Amino acid sequence: KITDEEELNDYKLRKRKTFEDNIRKNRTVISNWIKYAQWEESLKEIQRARSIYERALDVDYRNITLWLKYAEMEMKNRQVNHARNIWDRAITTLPRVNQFWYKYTY
RNA sequence: GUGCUCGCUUCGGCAGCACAUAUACUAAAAUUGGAACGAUACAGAGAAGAUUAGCAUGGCCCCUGCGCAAGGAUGACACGCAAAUUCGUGAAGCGUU
Ligand SMILES: [Mg+2]
Numbered sequence: 001k002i003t004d005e006e007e008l009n010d011y012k013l014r015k016r017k018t019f020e021d022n023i024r025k026n027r028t029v030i031s032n033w034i035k036y037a038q039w040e041e042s043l044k045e046i047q048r049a050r051s052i053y054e055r056a057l058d059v060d061y062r063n064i065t066l067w068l069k070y071a072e073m074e075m076k077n078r079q080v081n082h083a084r085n086i087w088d089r090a091i092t093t094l095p096r097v098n099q100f101w102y103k104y105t106y
Numbered sequence: 107g108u109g110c111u112c113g114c115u116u117c118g119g120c121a122g123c124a125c126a127u128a129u130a131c132u133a134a135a136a137u138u139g140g141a142a143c144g145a146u147a148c149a150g151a152g153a154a155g156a157u158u159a160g161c162a163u164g165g166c167c168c169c170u171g172c173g174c175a176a177g178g179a180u181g182a183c184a185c186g187c188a189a190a191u192u193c194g195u196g197a198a199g200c201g202u203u
């Protein structure tokens with residue numbers, strides 16, 4: 001059982017160290033990136049997760065589910081205009097992926 | 107500072123002219139931090155039973171070496187409840203238009 005925010009920040013230190021180490025190990029396949037972004041969005045610290053998805057798109061910008069998770073995080077957390085920018089950049093850089101167009105017109 | 111002035115004009119002073127023209131990470135310091143093995147306890151060396159040669163691979167890990175040699179335990183680390191987009195059948199019971 002966790003007390004006040006010192007032990008909470010220690011738990012966050014251990015988890016972020018584990019995820020950043022997994023990123024340093026692999027630097028490829030996005031399951032580490034997505035899991036670390038989901039863990040950061042689950043604690044309502046979504047600016048960390050915005051940075052995570054931007055780093056992961058710097059790694060691999062042609063991976064369409066990464067775009068889908070980043071835009072559905074920004075739709076889910078009521079940040080409409082962020083997600084709107086994300087879908088516009090998505091349909092600009094990947095114009096043949098119909099997933100982005102269907103979800104953005106939806 | 108020195109020299110020259112048919113300078114006052116004595117050997118005292120003054121005037122003029124000429125040459126000579128910008129050192130220093132400015133400390134004999136005050137400070138400010140990160141650091142020496144190595145001792146203290148703990149700690150024990152990969153490969154699916156055991157005993158073991160190793161060669162790699164990757165990078166916000168270094169050490170020895172002049173080394174693009176070779177060593178450092180195969181130098182160490184890497185060991186992960188390894189889940190990424192997107193579902194449908196058939197009957198059976200219950201309530202409903
Ligand atoms: Mg070697």
Ligand SMILES: [Mg+2]
Nearest residue numbers: 159160179180
């Ligand atoms: Mg050996």
Ligand SMILES: [Mg+2]
Nearest residue numbers: 162163180181
């Ligand atoms: Mg090696």
